[PDB]
Design a protein around this ligand. Sequence first.
Ligand SMILES: *C/C=C1/C(=C/C2=NC(=C\c3[nH]c(/C=C4\NC(=O)C(C=C)=C4C)c(C)c3CCC(=O)O)/C(CCC(=O)O)=C2C)NC(=O)C1C
Ligand SMILES: *C/C=C1/C(=C/C2=NC(=C\c3[nH]c(/C=C4\NC(=O)C(C=C)=C4C)c(C)c3CCC(=O)O)/C(CCC(=O)O)=C2C)NC(=O)C1C
Ligand SMILES: [Cl-]
Ligand SMILES: [Cl-]
Lengths: 484, 484
Amino acid sequence: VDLTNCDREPIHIPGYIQPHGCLIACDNAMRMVLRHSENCGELLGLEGDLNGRTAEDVLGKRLVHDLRNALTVTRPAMLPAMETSDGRSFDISLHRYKSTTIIEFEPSDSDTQPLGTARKMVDRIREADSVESLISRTTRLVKATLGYDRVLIYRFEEDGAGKVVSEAKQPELESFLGQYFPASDIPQQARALYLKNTLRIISDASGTPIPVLPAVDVSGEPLDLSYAHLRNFSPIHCEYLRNMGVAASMSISVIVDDALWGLIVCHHCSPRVLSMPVRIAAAMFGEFFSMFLQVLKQKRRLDTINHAHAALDRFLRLAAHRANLEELLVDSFQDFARLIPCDGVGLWVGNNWHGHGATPPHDAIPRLARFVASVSEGRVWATHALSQAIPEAEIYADTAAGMLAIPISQVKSDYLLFFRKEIVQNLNWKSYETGPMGDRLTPRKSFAIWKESVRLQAQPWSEADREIAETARIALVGVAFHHS
Amino acid sequence: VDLTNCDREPIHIPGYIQPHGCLIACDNAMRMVLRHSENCGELLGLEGDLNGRTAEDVLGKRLVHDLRNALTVTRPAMLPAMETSDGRSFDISLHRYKSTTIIEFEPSDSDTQPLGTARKMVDRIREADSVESLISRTTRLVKATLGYDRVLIYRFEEDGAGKVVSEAKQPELESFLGQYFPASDIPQQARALYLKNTLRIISDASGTPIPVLPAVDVSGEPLDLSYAHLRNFSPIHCEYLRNMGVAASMSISVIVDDALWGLIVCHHCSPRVLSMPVRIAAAMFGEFFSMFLQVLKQKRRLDTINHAHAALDRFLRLAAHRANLEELLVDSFQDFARLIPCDGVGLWVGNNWHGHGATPPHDAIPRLARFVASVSEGRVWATHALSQAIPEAEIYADTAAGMLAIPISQVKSDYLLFFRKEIVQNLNWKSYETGPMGDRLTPRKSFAIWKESVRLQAQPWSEADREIAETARIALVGVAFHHS
Ligand SMILES: *C/C=C1/C(=C/C2=NC(=C\c3[nH]c(/C=C4\NC(=O)C(C=C)=C4C)c(C)c3CCC(=O)O)/C(CCC(=O)O)=C2C)NC(=O)C1C
Ligand SMILES: *C/C=C1/C(=C/C2=NC(=C\c3[nH]c(/C=C4\NC(=O)C(C=C)=C4C)c(C)c3CCC(=O)O)/C(CCC(=O)O)=C2C)NC(=O)C1C
Ligand SMILES: [Cl-]
Ligand SMILES: [Cl-]
């Protein structure tokens, strides 16, 4: 495994598990054992090879009656504090995928209440009245409740890149708040797993991984550990964590509108297992956090569009009380900066330019106005990478790297131009020992690679930005026709 | 051409034009004439064959200088009252498609002002404050201004079917208001044309079509008349109009969010040509009608979701002041009918049923509740065709043909159920002589075929309906967790 085509590694079939539990694979109808982990013996107390031997034999008829009963009810069923034929107590994660029954065993924890812990946490977030307020309080809350050394919220940008939008940490540790990371740092097959396995744990990044027997069966097939919580993680990621001085992790998938919005990511500096009941509670908390964020995002989109409609209605009331519409636009145009987040706004009317805020230089505008007129086709036009459309625009990218243009006339070539500075201008942001695979696996190199990937580019225009621009196009084109 | 697989007929390459003008096809760079209409001679005054002869020869160097000048500026350029070498006056529709220049000639009309007519009309719709108010006033306005005998607005449903949502007509004519028509009555290749050619005219449905020479050239290629306003229409449609007693038509394409929302359709009982300047004005009017409807649709979606959020906030304030949540739901559930348009609503809580309005019978509910629990997977579930999911549900389809189910608990199998009657129950709706191809081509048979196609089906659940159900799911599941 080498660090070039990152999306290639099959992380779902590594043929190893983590040492904090043992795994037993059986046939579809759980009749007999097909595969098992090397540490099955040491933990369950059993001796010799377990493969071929029937299910009723290995675990006892008492236990299998309950396991087979539960499989009749792809989501893993979680049965805590089960009695084995020996008399030992285990927590059991049971699931079925690709017609293979998988049974995960871990030492029991009986002195926790899942729904109790979950409710207490969900109660403290349910009253949050903004995305910012939910995000900020969640990092603190999760840290105080699950006692991890650092808790991040990692939000995915449009281009797959990740931003650290919230942080709770021990004072001694370094901050990642406001730092970005490349799309490659979390490959595509990883995001696929995270969309179907909502909670993930690494107990010990420096632990010895326990191999599954057999790795490949008669048919040449590997064991798919997609929904298995004991699945061992890519050595690339584990080397990354080791270099960061992180011994353990727990991540929660944030699903909004059926898409992976981001991760709640917990780091610990010493090894750390969460017991099944604590994991159940944290997963409940994750589902509610996702649901509340979704509603809060919907409410913010509504408020943004409502505000734009009120703004435009105010302007249309003025426009009907003023003879010269061109005069009004020259006086008013900067006010349109309240509709769409921009670093500068400009009016191009009757081959005259009027600027406000961060705009390209006066001499550069006519080239830009001519270009827009050619590709616009009387529709809204927007790029976050201006230099890719006009190479000479590279020189003023620090001032204006992104442009959204609104036609304000049905007939004449007049435009309302919104600009954004290049994304590195708007940034509001230590030494790391490396492993065998080099200094690529450090937050320092990741952030430097991202910085390069976004050179001469602005924050992209959202759907909400484009929807408002379009409503503003119909408003200005409409009132322009009235006057003529 | 026979009436089975309707989407098959190539209406874009019929090799004929309408008699109210003449057509001349030239090469990409308009050097010489490749094709021409049989009536080119009679109208332009020219004698013999025009194919092969150079452009400069046929029209004169004076005219071609202006035509070639205009082609340098896929949208057809419209040049009214042009002087031919003879001295006659013609209105010229010039366009270029598939590297073939097409020139359309019609006798001139100089005693109209396009922008004047357009502004007067656009001024009367620009202040409309609801979709209903824009739709209703537009049919009357277009009838009074363009003097057509009947003006319809034909709105496309989700399944391609069309509904007559507005009508202005002569008293003597019969009404189509509230009638539906099958998706097949306007085939797919037709809707494709209408998305790129926004205005269409039939001068005379009983007129003799003029053939293009040659129909097929050396390469075996036909002349594509997609953007040509003289293109002759399918004889299926023309037979339809003849059976309706309609001699002429003019349709305007209504584009909303870059999709064909429907048509403004004008019928005349006598033959009728609209002059180029009148067509320009009507096309301007069509663009503004589309733009205003789009904004009004956006504003109505906003108001609907805002109202749902206020409703849910009111309910959450009550829920925090009441110990028994199940009591509150039993008292309150009918009020949820204000969120989503429904004919009935029901509560399934603790294996007890409470109904309100048009719901399935008491004895039928547990079967339905068991079914929903199996397919729901804790997500919102909705069908407009209940009998297709549960065959025995056919018997009560007149009362409840459609169902949307909201889970109200994270743990228990409790549901808020919304129902809709079958669409023919909610309907609020003469003899026709037929032609060679039978009685299929009559509004009577079309409406009867549609009625059959929607048997045992309700009005489908919109995106707005599903978005509100989802927000209500998160609200009820969220407050349910709080109580436990
Ligand atoms: C070429 C391959 C690379 C790569 C692959 C990779 N990353 C994976 C997981 C993963 N990566 C991150 C990244 C960070 N977490 C942090 O806290 C920081 C801090 C600066 C970074 C940059 C995260 C959060 C995750 C997910 C962790 C989790 O879910 O617990 C994986 C998948 C691991 C698996 O087996 O499931 C792969 C593969 N990462 C690289 O940087 C590179 C070059
Ligand atoms: C199997 C083929 C059929 C068919 C084909 C067809 N229809 C076309 C156009 C068209 N059809 C309608 C329908 C109506 N208009 C009305 O006013 C009423 C009133 C009750 C009906 C049912 C309309 C509006 C149009 C468009 C008219 C226009 O744009 O002016 C076409 C395309 C015609 C063309 O060459 O562009 C085709 C093909 N219609 C059938 O009913 C059937 C069975
Ligand atoms: Cl301000
Ligand atoms: Cl009411």
